[PDB]
Amino acid sequence: NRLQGKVAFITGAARGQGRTHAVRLAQDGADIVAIDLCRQNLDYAQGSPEELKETVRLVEEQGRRIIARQADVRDLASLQAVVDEALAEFGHIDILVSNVGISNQGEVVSLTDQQWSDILQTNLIGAWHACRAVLPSMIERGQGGSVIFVSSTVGLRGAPGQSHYAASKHGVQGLMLSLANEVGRHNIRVNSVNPGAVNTEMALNEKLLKMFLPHLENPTREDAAELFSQLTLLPIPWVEPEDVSNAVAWLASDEARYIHGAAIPVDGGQLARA
Amino acid sequence: NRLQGKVAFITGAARGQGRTHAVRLAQDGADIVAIDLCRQQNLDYAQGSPEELKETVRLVEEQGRRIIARQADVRDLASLQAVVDEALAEFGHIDILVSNVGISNQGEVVSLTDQQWSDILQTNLIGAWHACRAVLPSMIERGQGGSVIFVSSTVGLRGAPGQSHYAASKHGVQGLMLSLANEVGRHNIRVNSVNPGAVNTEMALNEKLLKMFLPHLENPTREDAAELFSQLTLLPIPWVEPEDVSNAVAWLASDEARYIHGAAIPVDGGQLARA
Amino acid sequence: NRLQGKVAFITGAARGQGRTHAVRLAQDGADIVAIDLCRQQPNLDYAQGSPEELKETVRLVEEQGRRIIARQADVRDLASLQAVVDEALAEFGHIDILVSNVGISNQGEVVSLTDQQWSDILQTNLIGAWHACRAVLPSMIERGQGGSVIFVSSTVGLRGAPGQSHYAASKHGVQGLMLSLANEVGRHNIRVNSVNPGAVNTEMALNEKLLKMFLPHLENPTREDAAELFSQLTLLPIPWVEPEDVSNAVAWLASDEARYIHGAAIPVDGGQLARA
Amino acid sequence: NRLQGKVAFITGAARGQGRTHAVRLAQDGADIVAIDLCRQNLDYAQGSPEELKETVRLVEEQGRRIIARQADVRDLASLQAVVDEALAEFGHIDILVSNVGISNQGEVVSLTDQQWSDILQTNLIGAWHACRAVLPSMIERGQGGSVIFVSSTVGLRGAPGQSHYAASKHGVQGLMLSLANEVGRHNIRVNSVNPGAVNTEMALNEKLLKMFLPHLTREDAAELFSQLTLLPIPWVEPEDVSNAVAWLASDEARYIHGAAIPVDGGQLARA
Ligand code: NA
Ligand code: NA
Ligand code: NA
Ligand code: NA
């Protein structure tokens, strides 16, 4: 197991991308600390308690140990509570996966204070909170570790109709680079993965599709494939959550021990498109 | 007279960088709408006062320009809308928006507080968006294009240990900049950032900030500051001046720069290029 | 009069972007050293600089009230450039601003490009740019007044370009040269930057052979067909920038207004690089 | 065995970075086509025919096949001859590792025409030659593939005293991005790995160290270079670069395209 004896803390783990992170790192021998708000302003399906229970089953199916808790990344104390439990049961946290957050839509002149507040609190402040909660024990344990920020192509380019979301993931990259300069010295590697279109309910939701395809009354998954296929260079409409999780699992492994300060696009060429 | 007939809306205009924006654009013919909070805040440097805003007004009127200056809070959309409405009533149009510097304070990732993150984002990122929200509808409707210049920082393009919230906030401004550039380019509204490194201002050279970089020194001086920051620049300078930032702003606003769009221009004597 | 008293050395000055740089820096009060190969190269399918076109650049600069030394020269040949610099220095005493111009291009996919295309494009665009630096810089260091080096690059110095990988490699190379040079001569108060135009209104950027690559469904593409293509690439409502626009950026970088801009690559592209 | 059934063509494979790539891919089950000029203006030990035999020995010890040939990346025909032999023997080439090239020193005013010609010819034109030689079969087979340029942190930042080397590796990035746009549609993935200081003769030789430490060993190297990394290391190992290359060629990284991955312990991110 490439991650044998490691413990990975994963946010948004009830479903989607966060679930795939837990199973994939579990596959590599990592025990898991999993949190999700487990509650449904956002126009797609989010995690539930039943879905977190499935994440648990799936990780336990791989022969691993898991602590799964309802928690709120927007709330430091809520995270510290779970970190404290993990540490009492597992002794250490070696890998932090600050997963993907939330998004909704609108133009600069049309966005609301509520939309800015929500997106920053969840996507930026929440990523910082996970860091603030986990790093003290990681620094104290003295064995190094990994902080992987699950960001986005919109952390590295503009996104019309999504300026708040792009501002938030740009902010995550600023956090990442700043963190890399603080905790490098401790052998704590800090990197981002930057997916483009991904096969999830969050990335492919009808509301978002309508913004890009305002002429269509009910845009379908086929319509989405036709839109997003033009953005990738590879013959694909989007990557899978597993492709993002594979990158995360590699960064956490000794194979990638000296990778630090990187933003790795997982996008089939979107960011390289001429 | 490169900006004759234009009106520029400038934030943090009471002193320092914002003041120099106001004076420089006025020198080129722009009339001015200037706001500042005019309150000394959680920060460890001198900030703008009402008396300093009055002096900004004297300096602009001495260039033969018109100015509307008001106390306003960029953190509060309704407060900015009130000023924009007055400006549009008096001046008819706002052609240039300069979203100026914001605020900072210090701390490592593990030691920063919620208050620090909240405050820095609210002023530096939300505040910048509020100025855009407040100003763009009239600029779009007026139909003659215009300019949005975000005054950011080298830490919107690189990390800053001990300043992760600040760097996050300025990265966020770059993200806002690039997105807006895709939304309003079509209206011939040009959107760019200027990205100063170390600048000669009370905000960039304040003692608490200097002590972060120089923790062994008991009372780091301006001369200690020169010796530190000089190592960062490639040009033989300790830092740029506020005037150098304001020149870049005034160039972007002119017809000489009419098709520059989506650009982040470092005004840093080479800091970002340093090998 | 923002450049009064300055001497600008400009490559590829016969027509197109080179001419506009000469004229625009002249307008700002700089005297001009202008070089162009002045030969129609058969490996390039667009009108290039000719002696007659250099004579008209001379006429336009003198009409602004400026002096100009205009010479046929090959940037691919170090000795050729050193001879023009030595003449410049004998007549004017100093060279303050080096404008390393846009160079040349032709088309081909990675699997289809020839050794000749690679050798040609790098010789003129990259080695040539270094030649200009190699030849002008010793005097500019010795004289101890600082100066400006301004590379005229491209959006394809900052992104990939399908069908033009040698051209995009050459301008990426120019960026690497710029940044390295920035680290060497910064201490001398010599500022080093690039300007990076997108689609610009010249024969090099809009010639029919190039358009055909981009519009393979069109038998004989026109300037209208070019406008309709390139307009989709800019965020501003224009088909391309004008070479005057590139020159205004050059002229500003050379001025005291931009005295501390160093190590920058400024896109002049109506938002092409920022497009989502 | 992540690379089972694949054939990797590796340039500069006699020693150093090149050799570790061969062995690392062989470890993942790839067969290998290895070339090196095998010949000594460069102030460090370069590959020899004896070092190529040892690369063969180490790859064979993994139970793989290898075709190892003296060839010159500066000469397209020389490369086409080796590609044609590999195709006659293996039937296909799936992975191209355009590995690391050469360097020497000089400021912009002090470099020679010969210095620029040699560095561009080996580093940039050589890299293009490899692509030119390998891609037609790779496209025609219609199975996709991987092109991995071994580049440098100096393809992404400036390098005082090394402007020609930095120009060459910036150039590699341009070729990479351009190529990514041409052959993506064929499911041919194109990326770069960008190491900083690496533990090799080329990265660490005394002539180069002198340029960086003009007031003056390995220990001298490590004390200087340690300042550049954020992690507590003096440099990466060649094995670290080879690990990145091997991951990118695997199904684990199947959709990573147009990326430049720094392998530098934080050098590019340093504030
Ligand atoms: Na596609
Ligand atoms: Na300096
Ligand atoms: Na357009
Ligand atoms: Na280090």
Residue numbers in the entry:
A (entry chain C): 20 to 59, 62 to 295
B (entry chain D): 20 to 60, 62 to 295
C (entry chain A): 20 to 295
D (entry chain B): 20 to 59, 62 to 237, 241 to 295
Relevant lines from the article:
Here we present a series of TIGR03971 SDR crystal structures from several mycobacterial species which contain an insertion in the primary sequence at the NAD cofactor binding site.
Each of these SDRs contain an insertion in the protein sequence at the cofactor binding site. With the exception of the M. thermoresistibile target which did not contain NAD, all other mycobacterial SDR target crystal structures contained NAD, which appears to have co-purified with the protein after expression in E. coli. In addition to the insertion loop which covers the adenosine portion of the cofactor, a second loop which typically contains two α-helices covers much of nicotinamide mononucleotide portion of the cofactor. In contrast, this loop is ordered in each of the mycobacterial SDR crystal structures presented here.
